[PDB]
Design a protein around this ligand. Structure first.
Ligand code: 1VU
Ligand code: COA
Ligand code: COA
Ligand code: COA
Lengths: 439, 439, 439, 446
């Protein structure tokens, strides 16, 4: 029985192409069993712990406790076949049905920051829609990704699925990703990664979903529950060491509440840097010569980052907080580290304007703490982000403490929003002329 | 006041970019007024006839009568702002709203087969979704396209719209089209045209919706209403001289009813060619040396085509019919001419199998005449086309005699189906954590 | 042709029963034409003004300018056949369709407060769903109701409807109403009226929709836009002289803003009574010996009510306002007069508790002015009213300045909410076993 | 023209007044519970009936106490109620946003619901009603039939035990120690009952609609199954025998007369007998069965309702093995077996000339119940015509009638099928009041 891992990308694609042809003969009940199997794989406590620990050990990024939550979020709240609704319209001209049907072979690029969550979430959605999926995982997460694919293949084999619904290559690489993106039998590309790989998949001549960059501002105005806001912001920013695409990456605080907010942030585990010499040491540690984030620091804990500049703090410290001007690189750059700059502004309207500016027209994610329905509406409407979270941590936008389903492929540039099974399906219209209008 | 036509593509794109920024400040009521304005433009009887006549004259393709119908179909049954529905979910974690918001500037490539219908349909959908649109019309439809753009800009100015919501260039060209595709301020590309241009917009690094090619088979089995089938098939095949992407392009008839079908086809205006020499004359006329359709004959009437091989017939002749083997170029090629080959097969199951084969995995459009719900289901399910029409003319798939809305941008490889305003919008999720859950 | 007005209730019902049998043979396109026909009847400006003036002059209740708005609201925002959506579910077991189909003959009881609005709203919804309707109008609004029915029948005759889709009797009476309730061919009763007649239609052994009483509190807390709240409250309370079921009938104001609210209410046309002797005069005028509203005062203007106690004011006076304890009859009673008591409370939580109490478990309508999303949510969730309006006049709950459709039959005990065509339809399920599953 | 077709309180109270008062207090407390709480309680009810020992006990006990139905099929129907009754996911939200802000439409509780349950589906209805009503945030007072007293009270106690272990307010689901029609009348009259739900015959439906309260009435049917010449006749015979004999013809949807186009009627009958139909051709034997199963007034004998074909045949001296599932007879349309809703595995066949005649006759013998009808036909035009004209709450094409209840057809299940009051297949939504929340000029974030 195939374990889904192939020596060459071309062999993987051919196998997934044959698999998806056979898959088309399977029932929706079969699909639901396979979907549940993937859930059972990642939600099995032993595998859940193994995937969460292994990703941290292999990538050096994130933390075990939060990957437990994120992997479980992927397993529990990714939509299954119930996502594939049917539209119907009946009248004098008969019945029209609109269905979500498979693309075929989907090629999926997955990140090193959420390797297992994206595989679980992509796999469930793509197989629910009747596709097979070829994964090109990031080489930095090769071992955990290949093991997850093999575990999924083992489970699907036990469930009587066609072999090779979920496949990858023995040696993930840029070149194998290139081969996947260029293979004629790949019908759609899905890229969860940085803007480079997204531009690439959108340059292949193929249908592509691209999950893009963010720089999420969190605005706090004078009407917010400041004590809850501080707790939410620390939790959101430090969740998996700031790896989630939605995670807070700069605070924009109205002046009249900024000090009390800072006070409560420190109460909730923020380590405040005031010494500009200490701040400069941190900028030297976490920024490249080009001014971008140091990969060696991405997804490291606040404790670890502080230890690297000679500062020893206990486990209660969750973020590194500093009040800085808006031009500071911690504000402008998407660090993907639990380093959270705060910019003080005079009014909520200034805060909204600055949040739009620093979000850089990524239109990805933004957060606001405010009880004023008018200011919540104004910021949400103006900033036009794929995800907008009000009065909660950023991960409420992923279904953790907010209503809705979860995803780990959030599509901004291509506009799909929170991808689910429907996103991996072709919309088909079936017209029964002058029949089946039984009203 | 700008008329919407610019000397350079870069000027058109920059003007649309400013226009859309201003458009974001307009109400949904404003959008509805602008949508209605575009409907009023094309549905105005004088403009309706002028657009239909000018398109036929300038392109040499289609017929005036059917372009009246198609332009009216675009003006009347293209969804407006009511397409932009809202999803809501409420519970213990509060309320989550999901909305359709604008992309920004959309670059739209329009074909010379449906120049005005596509402009009307794209404009309504894209403006309804809060976008501006830059059109790159086909050079062979330059004059009618630019006049429509001018008339739209005139109407929108009278309605108080931002200037330059709908723009184009003075000199349409493949060079200007490539310039639009490369322009950084174009946020999404929409290509209604051949596979080459669709592959191109999908190779730009941008979100792109691409139309697809088809080769629509119409299967007729022994349970069909043969008299109605023959009428539907002639009407559908000869609609705008076989220009529509959905139009029937080969008949696959169960042998037991083929002769009765052919008899009724002839009664409905089919000119049957049985002389293999006359057939060869037709092939030499309508096929290039490479075997593809001759541009000079695309969209020409059956009367005109027969006259070019010296056969004079009255206006009651709508299609040219011939019984040929499946390998014949008229079967294999997407002629876009009212030339309709018929292949005879033993059983409905063979008809379904052959229909799948000759559709060439375009998964675009197929048609079936049959009253057997099992065979209707089998063919529709297996052939997996974006549009499937049962017991009607192909154009029932576009809302003309079938339930649903109309479009003239039917997505091919990108899977949106019949594009509408929704297709030109980004999906946005707004999460009100632990509030607005008022159940 | 029949003008739809019959000498006996039995003849009206028999005619409507035959009409609906014939109506079943009409298309959805026919239904849509008839719906548009009724809209055209009431939306014709000259007819709109005639109906509005005639109702006020015949009943003595309401005012002309606002009946213009309400009749237009009924004609413009009552859902048509688009309300009758189709649900579909497809899978291994085939296709299931769920449709909204006619009840048959519906007997509709209409009020003297909104005679023409209810006839328009009921007629459009009931005919859209494929029913016929027998109206039993209130005797006080006899002639305006019969004139509307005759105009509908004339319009429908011209549009080619079966005669007698909409019928009534020449002499409305409680006896004819009882005969409608008792008639075996009436398949559903709809009662828009006071609780006695609603209890009656729910005691007939028939499916019945019943209106409810209300006593709508409007809460204003310290976060509200007080200037806007004052304007909204005056407009909502005095709308058609407080006849609408949704209209504000007591203010519960948080002490922090109560005086400034009263100040702004007076600037918007509130006449404030502080003299307890004058207040006692008003109570003597508007209350019966048993403490309920005087019918002779229901729907009278504030100008008229003040003149009846010897106070002469100009037309800028829209409501009579008094700060009183919660036990005051004007708070406790649904006056249906532009008399608006204000009760002052310590906190928004006290305001919510009191609003729930004085709403008397009608669960009909409540209104809140507050910008705190938490307090808006708390009150909306706790008071459990069929309509809840936030930061607007009460009539925004009927589609006048709020999103959604309008109705003038807001169900009370029967739970349908804002009745529309769906409410007048039977839900039917059509199961195509193992076919038409074409995904 | 093919002649072969085409191949701690336990929830049980001394008086109705006490039960209603307890459920009213319970529902006030329930309003403070979260949707997560409701979901736990819904799952608790599912766990009660789907527990294998309780599933078997409920199914066996209902048959033994009522004398109606059969154990194997009540296992299926009870499991169908537990598995496919919608939960809180039924309570969807509508939203509309624009220049005037945001409007939300929600499904909110009625309060105390009084539910009358039948002796033909006593546990399935309790399970199905309980799940839907609690999902929507109501409490429910059950008034079961005296003939199903013991099994109904046990189920209520088991539900109360489970909900107590899950931390629910006491008495979300209640009933009375002594079920009686008089207690049903008392429940219908109680001021604190906000809605009545009646799963029963036409008299009880009329009664709940005569109370001054909102009532959902799930009425009678007489479901015809039309078979035309385009049908898969072999499958139709199998489906018809299975649907008619399901729980001994107790389900409201079950086939109760065949209307067969003449050209396939004999081949259909041959296949019906192949699939377990015992055909009576002897008019003397047919008269014997009529004397057995019809009362002096001509209605069904309660002693025979829900009895097996085997048992019914034995009562007229005919011994057959357990492969016999229905008693089949070809008769004129006027025959009482056609006209009456027997709720017995007795299935008359009426032969007609054409499918259009079959449709006309099916409409006629369905008696404007507009409840359930079934058609076997592959012709999309005749399927549409019959479905459109007969206007039934449930229409099943090319399957057994119980495919209309989510068993072999798409959709959810219910055991309260509302024709007269029009709710259709009742679910949690049906037990909720629609509420509209209008946020004027805010929360329009498009
Ligand atoms: C938001 C938009 C909306 O407001 S929705 C529209 C719903 N409007 C209402 O329900 C208004 C409630 N009606 C009332 O309060 C009263 O009718 C008011 C306005 C005080 C008028 O007084 P009055 O003339 O005495 O009418 P009434 O209903 O109180 O009773 C008078 C007798 O007439 C009867 N009646 C009632 N409706 C009908 C009818 N359609 N046809 C024949 N008779 C009717 C009543 O039963 C009553 O007779 P009886 O004394 O009960 O025997
Ligand atoms: C991935 C990360 C370690 C970047 O560090 P890095 O040193 O630049 O390493 P990269 O692998 O990304 O860069 C080398 C190439 O590998 C490409 N690449 C990204 N994912 C890849 C994948 N699954 N397979 C093959 N190549 C991949 C990158 O596009 C990049 O191309 P480039 O050299 O042209 O820029 C991390 O810091 C990061 O930026 N993650 C963002 C990705 C993301 O947004 N994921 C969304 C999670 S929901
Ligand atoms: C276009 C047509 C009338 C004539 O074919 P033709 O002689 O090759 O004419 P064209 O060369 O201009 O056809 C498209 C060509 O111009 C380009 N082109 C297409 N649309 C263009 C546009 N709006 N602007 C600029 N260039 C365009 C294409 O890149 C292609 O280039 P190519 O000649 O190198 O292949 C006919 O072949 C046709 O319409 N085919 C199908 C197109 C279609 O799918 N229409 C569906 C509309 S709903
Ligand atoms: C089996 C049955 C037919 C017994 O018939 P019966 O012996 O002649 O009459 P009953 O024993 O029911 O008692 C007579 C009255 O009790 C009433 N009744 C029915 N169910 C009742 C209940 N749960 N509680 C109190 N009274 C009830 C009815 O008014 C019935 O009137 P009826 O004789 O006109 O039918 C009957 O009890 C029954 O439940 N039928 C099911 C009808 C139905 O549509 N059920 C829906 C199943 S999902």
């Amino acid at each position: 029985v195939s374990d889904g891992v192939f020596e060459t990308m071309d062999a993987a694609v051919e196998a997934a192409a044959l698999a998806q042809q056979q898959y088309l003969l399977c029932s929706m009940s079969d699909r639901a069993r396979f979907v549940q199997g993937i859930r059972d794989v990642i939600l099995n406590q032993d595998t859940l712990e193994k995937m969460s620990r292994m990703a941290v050990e292999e990538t050096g990024m994130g933390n075990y406790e939060h990957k437990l939550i994120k992997n479980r979020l992927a397993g529990e709240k990714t939509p299954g076949i119930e996502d594939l609704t049917t539209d119907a319209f009946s009248g004098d001209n008969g019945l029209t049905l609109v269905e979500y049907s498979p693309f075929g072979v989907i090629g999926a690029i997955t990140p090193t920051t959420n390797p297992t969550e994206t595989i679980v979430c992509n796999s469930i959605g793509m197989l629910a829609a009747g596709n097979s999926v070829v994964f090109s995982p990031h080489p930095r997460a090769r071992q955990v990704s290949l093991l997850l694919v093999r575990l999924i293949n083992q489970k699907l084999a036990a469930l009587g699925a066609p072999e090779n619904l979920v496949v990858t290559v023995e040696k993930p690489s840029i070149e194998n990703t290139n081969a996947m993106m260029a293979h004629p039998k790949v019908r759609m590309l899905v890229a969860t990664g940085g803007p480079a790989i997204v531009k690439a998949v959108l340059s292949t001549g193929k249908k592509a979903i691209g999950a893009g960059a963010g720089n999420p501002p969190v605005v706090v105005d004078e009407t917010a529950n400041i004590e809850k806001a501080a707790c939410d912001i620390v939790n959101g920013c430090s969740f998996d060491n700031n790896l989630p695409x939605v995670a807070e990456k700069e605070i924009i605080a109205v002046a009249q509440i900024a000090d009390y907010l800072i006070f409560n942030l420190k109460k909730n585990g923020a380590y405040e840097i005031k010494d500009p010499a200490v701040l400069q040491q941190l900028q030297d540690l976490v920024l490249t010569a080009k001014g971008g984030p140091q990969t060696k620091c991405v997804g490291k804990s606040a404790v670890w980052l502080l230890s690297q500049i000679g500062i020893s703090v206990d486990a209660s410290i969750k973020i590194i907080l500093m009040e800085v001007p808006r031009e500071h690189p911690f504000v402008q750059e998407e660090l993907m580290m639990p380093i959270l700059p705060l910019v003080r502004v005079e009014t909520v309207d200034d805060a909204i304007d600055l949040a739009i500016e620093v979000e850089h027209d990524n239109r990805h994610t933004a957060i606001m703490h405010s009880t004023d329905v008018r200011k919540l509406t104004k910021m949400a409407k103006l900033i036009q982000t794929t995800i907008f979270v009000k009065n909660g941590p950023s991960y409420a936008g992923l279904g953790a403490g907010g209503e809705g389903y979860s995803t780990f492929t959030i599509a901004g540039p291509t506009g799909e929003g929170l991808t689910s099974a429907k996103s991996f399906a072709r919309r088909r219209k079936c017209v029964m002329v002058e029949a089946l209008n039984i009203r």
